[PDB]
Amino acid sequence: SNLFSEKRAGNRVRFFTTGRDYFSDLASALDSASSSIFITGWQVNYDVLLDGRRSLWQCLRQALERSPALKVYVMPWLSPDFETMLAVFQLNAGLEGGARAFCTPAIQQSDMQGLGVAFSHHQKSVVIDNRIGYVGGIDLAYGRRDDNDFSLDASGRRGNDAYNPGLPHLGWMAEDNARLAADQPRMPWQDVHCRIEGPSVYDLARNFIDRWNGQQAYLAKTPALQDTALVRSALEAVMKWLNSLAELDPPTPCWINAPEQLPQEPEVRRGGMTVQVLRSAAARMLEQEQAGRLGAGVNLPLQVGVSTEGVQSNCKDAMLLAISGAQQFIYIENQFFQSEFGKEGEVFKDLPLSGPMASLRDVGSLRRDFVVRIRLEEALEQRDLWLLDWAEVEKIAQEPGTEARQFLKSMLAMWGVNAQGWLTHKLGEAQHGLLNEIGEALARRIERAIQREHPFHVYLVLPVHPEGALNVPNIMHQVHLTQQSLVFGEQSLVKRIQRQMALKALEGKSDPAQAREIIERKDARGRPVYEQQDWSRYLTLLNLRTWAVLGGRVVTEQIYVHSKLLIADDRVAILGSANINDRSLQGERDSELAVMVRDSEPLTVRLDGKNDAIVGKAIHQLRVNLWKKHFGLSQGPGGFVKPASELSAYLSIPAAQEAWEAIQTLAKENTRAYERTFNFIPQNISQTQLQLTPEPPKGFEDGFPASIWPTWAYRKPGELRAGGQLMEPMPYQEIFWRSSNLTSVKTFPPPNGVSGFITALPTSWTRGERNDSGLNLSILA
Ligand SMILES: [Ca+2]
């Protein structure tokens, strides 16, 4: 209970349900700046158009020129560059008097020891004249600006604002110079953000200033100079309190300590929206904050019960409590969902790594004759690249043919891959399994409704897969983990709801001490009984996805759920930077910023369609307004996806059963429609893998689970270890898009009768595959 701040009434909050909204409101805010502009983010591209005409840089410049006192402070995260300092340099260029705009790349401050390089500052905050505060999931970066059309036509933006990290860029920029070819689709951005006025902006400013003055006390580029900086600050401080009574050298700090920039303690207000500001901050971050408060001499009046010392897991804590006090339903949007799930489960035995993943780092992927000839496994166990038969590799490099070339190529590839793993594994310890308990908590809230015979329901909107191409090792690994937390881990979120349903199903039909054995009992297709329960009665799992005709091509890509948002009962909303993973929630690792928000303005709804329930007006809207976005009820002229008006009746009865059955049904039909044409999108049953047996093998009744790479097929459906290949192209492949002169471009029937953007999360995707990149799990957790 190390609170970074505590609830304050009296706030006015405006939610932003689109990228374009936030960006446009930001520009108009900067048009009004006068004293100070605090910016911080995980990534800050000074060149993004905010109102589709002016770059951030221009608004910053136009503002410095207008307001002669305006001081401007950027705190980008410091990726293990020149761009940011140069841009800031350019903001001070030709200015009136000295420089008024400053930067400070923020080095991580996590408690992760030698693993500490792999963590960041993930906060997305901007604060203007200590009067307008922004916070949410949206950085000021390429690909973020987006509306409710979720268009795929990259051609309308320029630069890397034609965003799509999962696709080879095979077009050209007319003034390297690559970009998204006309026929290639953008990847759309669904995110949630908010502006805040009232007392709580104080806590937002305090987070910025204390964080800035923290990195300054440690701005010293060398560990050595750093003691000299902390003895100079101890001295210029005693000098301040004395003037208030009547070679080897550190840098001159740049404090934020002038009174214009500092904000004045808020009064106790009442009404409007109650807001609490929440951080994920590590103990080491917390001390270096205490450091700067001495350095700059800024001790901003704290509230009673806030903590200047200890790890801060306000994000995970706030979420947990909202999850347990929820009465009717939970609705979550989040880019991540990896949470503790017990023993890993459902990987095939006699297949150590998944096929695809083994093709990227298992040496058995390669011919045994070349692997023994160069003595690969001797080197691999000794991690001496040079402990190899360099005589036999020449013999192989002199041998003509493709199999000899592809070998040496993939051989070095696996070495580089594996070597990564070894690194991360020696930088620190590898936690076993996941740590945060949002899974357990959701499962537990559901079981309380199961056991006491109440209705309840949890909505989860996630990305189809993490952004990028599905063949990158870590990305595979995040999927693998994501499914573990949802469907596969022996204590996964569905297996937990299901056990519980099974257990209540036996009430008064068997002895209670026996039940835990009865539900774990095995059936005909080898699965346990508890899996006979329809968890759909409590949990809905949705991906977002659109399609389009671009350049005469039928294409599809996912709509990326970057949102980090949670709502319950339309009474409470938790908004910000925190992903349902360990990096964000635990506190000691990545730094995060979020808010809890409640509305004192009430409103009456039948959340279950029958009984009166009181909700917060602004929170109720937000969920309704989002549900419109993804239901297609908010787009405008154009696009290839019809409004899903069948759903427009359910926006105001989220806890009614009809409602989540509606959404469940359409999302199954929408996904079935895409599956009819697209054999590459992640999905439950593989459509490239053929049964070559008389009877489907054990468990593979009904079909074969799709690979992480869905057009993959295993060569020998018994020797899953033997391997396999890509029966057909994947989007991430060049050959997906241009006919290599040998072979021609495949294409696809347009999806027929899709409505809205809502999709069914493949609960079977990857089943059986262990896609373990071999990187230290604490980095992927
Ligand atoms: Ca549209």
Read out DSSP for 136-166? ES--B-TT----SS---BGGGS-GGGS--TT
Q: How far is ligand 1, taken at its centre, from the CA of residue 165, in Å? A: 23
Q: How far is ligand 1, taken at its centre, from the CA of residue 186, in Å? A: 14
- How is residue 225 annotated by DSSP? H
Give the CATH number, domain containing residue 34.
3.30.870.10
Q: Is 608 inside a domain boundary? A: no
CA distance 654 to 254: 51
Q: For residue 272, what are the CA distances in angstroms to 199, 277, 293, 317?
A: 11, 16, 32, 24
274 and 401 housed in the same domain: no
Which residues does residue 768 pair with via DSSP β-bridges, in sequence order? Answer: none
Give SS3 for 27: helix
CA distance 26 to 37: 11
CA distance 122 to 528: 41
CA 58, 60, 62, 64 torsion: positive or negative? Answer: negative
Pick the last residue of a domain from 399, 426, 453.
Answer: 426
- Enumerate the H helices of 453-528 as residue ranges: 473-483, 493-505, 512-518
| Best CA proximity match to 548, nearest among 19, 160, 156 | 156
- Cβ atoms of 433 and 781 within 8 Å: the answer is no
- Cβ atoms of 580 and 334 within 8 Å: the answer is yes
- How is residue 705 annotated by DSSP? B
303 and 154 housed in the same domain: yes
173 and 53 housed in the same domain: yes
Q: How far is ligand 1, taken at its centre, from the CA of residue 153, in Å? A: 11
Which residues does residue 576 pair with via DSSP β-bridges, in sequence order? Answer: 594
138 and 263 housed in the same domain: yes
Q: How far is ligand 1, taken at its centre, from the CA of residue 206, in Å? A: 41
Residue with tokens 């996941």: 434
For the range 58-65, what are the long-range contacts, defined as Cβ-Cβ under 8 Å and sequence gap of 24 or more? 59/26, 59/27, 59/30, 59/31, 60/30, 60/91, 60/101, 61/91, 62/30, 62/31, 63/30, 63/31, 63/33, 63/37, 64/91, 64/95, 64/100, 64/101
Cα angle 206-212-218, degrees, rounded to a multiple of 5: 135
Q: How far is ligand 1, taken at its centre, from the CA of residue 332, in Å? A: 24
- Cβ atoms of 165 and 469 within 8 Å: the answer is yes
SS3 per residue for 394-435: HHHHHCCCHHHHHHHHHHHHHHHHHHHHHHHHHCCCCCCCCC
390 and 241 housed in the same domain: no
Q: How far is ligand 1, taken at its centre, from the CA of residue 54, in Å? A: 25
Pick the last residue of a domain from 426, 445, 473.
Answer: 426
Q: How far is ligand 1, taken at its centre, from the CA of residue 757, in Å? A: 11
Q: How far is ligand 1, taken at its centre, from the CA of residue 637, in Å? A: 5
126 and 266 housed in the same domain: yes
The resolution of the experimental structure, rounded to one decimal in Å, is: 3.0
Q: Which two tokens stand for residue 461?
A: 């909107």
Q: How far is ligand 1, taken at its centre, from the CA of residue 760, in Å? A: 21
Give the H/E segment covering residue 279: strand 273-281
User: By residue range, what is the domain housing residue 235?
Assistant: 8-312
Q: Is 298 inside a domain boundary? A: yes
Q: Is 727 inside a domain boundary? A: no
CA distance 352 to 362: 9
- Cβ atoms of 192 and 15 within 8 Å: the answer is yes
CA distance 568 to 549: 38
Q: For residue 459, what are the CA distances in angstroms to 237, 280, 539?
A: 53, 24, 6
| Phi, psi for 329 (deg, rounded to 5) | -160, 160
Q: Which two tokens stand for residue 239?
A: 């000098």
What helix, strand, coil percent values describe the chain, rounded to 5?
35, 20, 45
Does the annotation place 638 within a ligand binding site?
yes
- Cβ atoms of 192 and 335 within 8 Å: the answer is no
Does the annotation place 149 within a ligand binding site?
yes
CA distance 197 to 199: 7
The gap from C-alpha 169 to its chain's centroid, in whole angstroms, comes to 23
Residue with tokens 């991580």: 108
40 and 142 housed in the same domain: yes
Residues 6+ apart with CB under 8 A from 22: 16, 134, 136, 138, 193, 195
134 and 267 housed in the same domain: yes
Q: Is 183 inside a domain boundary? A: yes
Angle between helices 390-398 and 402-426 (to 10 degrees): 140
- How is residue 48 annotated by DSSP? -
| Best CA proximity match to 275, nearest among 43, 85, 630, 4 | 4
| Phi, psi for 487 (deg, rounded to 5) | -120, -20
| Phi, psi for 378 (deg, rounded to 5) | -65, -50
Angle between helices 283-292 and 201-217 (to 10 degrees): 80
CA distance 377 to 382: 8
CA distance 202 to 125: 13
Q: How far is ligand 1, taken at its centre, from the CA of residue 166, in Å? A: 23
Residue 342: which region, alpha, beta or left (left: phi > 0; alpha: psi -120 to 50)? left
Does the annotation place 635 within a ligand binding site?
yes
Pick the last residue of a domain from 257, 287, 312.
Answer: 312
Q: How far is ligand 1, taken at its centre, from the CA of residue 634, in Å? A: 8
Q: How far is ligand 1, taken at its centre, from the CA of residue 643, in Å? A: 9
278 and 414 housed in the same domain: no
CA distance 685 to 675: 10
Q: How far is ligand 1, taken at its centre, from the CA of residue 635, in Å? A: 4
Q: Is 729 inside a domain boundary? A: no
Give SS3 for 74: strand
Q: How far is ligand 1, taken at its centre, from the CA of residue 544, in Å? A: 15
Q: How far is ligand 1, taken at its centre, from the CA of residue 189, in Å? A: 14
Q: In the PDB record, what is the listed experimental method? A: X-ray
Q: Is 89 inside a domain boundary? A: yes
272 and 186 housed in the same domain: yes
| Best CA proximity match to 730, nearest among 749, 744, 711, 747 | 711
How many C-beta atoms lie closer than 10 Å to residue 523's C-beta? 10
Q: How far is ligand 1, taken at its centre, from the CA of residue 446, in Å? A: 36
33 and 103 housed in the same domain: yes
CA distance 108 to 728: 42
Q: How far is ligand 1, taken at its centre, from the CA of residue 668, in Å? A: 22
Overall domain count for the chain: 2
If you count them, how many residues does the chain have?
781
Q: How far is ligand 1, taken at its centre, from the CA of residue 159, in Å? A: 23
Burial 396-410 (b: 16+ CB within 10 A, else e): beeeeeeebeebeee
Q: How far is ligand 1, taken at its centre, from the CA of residue 550, in Å? A: 14
Q: Is 138 inside a domain boundary? A: yes
Q: Which two tokens stand for residue 434?
A: 């996941």
> What string of DSSP letters covers 312-372?
EEHHHHHHHHHHHS-SSEEEEEES-B----SS---PPSS-SS-HHHHHHH-GGGS-HHHHH
Residue with tokens 């349902």: 580
CA distance 419 to 5: 43
211 and 74 housed in the same domain: yes
Q: How far is ligand 1, taken at its centre, from the CA of residue 674, in Å? A: 18
- HSE on the CB side for 157, CA within 13 Å? 27
| Best CA proximity match to 498, nearest among 761, 765, 319, 763 | 763
* DSSP H helix total and E strand total for the chain: 20, 25
Burial 274-288 (b: 16+ CB within 10 A, else e): bbbbbbbbbbbbbeb
Residue with tokens 């070679």: 247
| Best CA proximity match to 777, nearest among 121, 446, 459, 338 | 338
Q: Is 695 inside a domain boundary? A: no
| Best CA proximity match to 464, nearest among 489, 491, 483 | 483
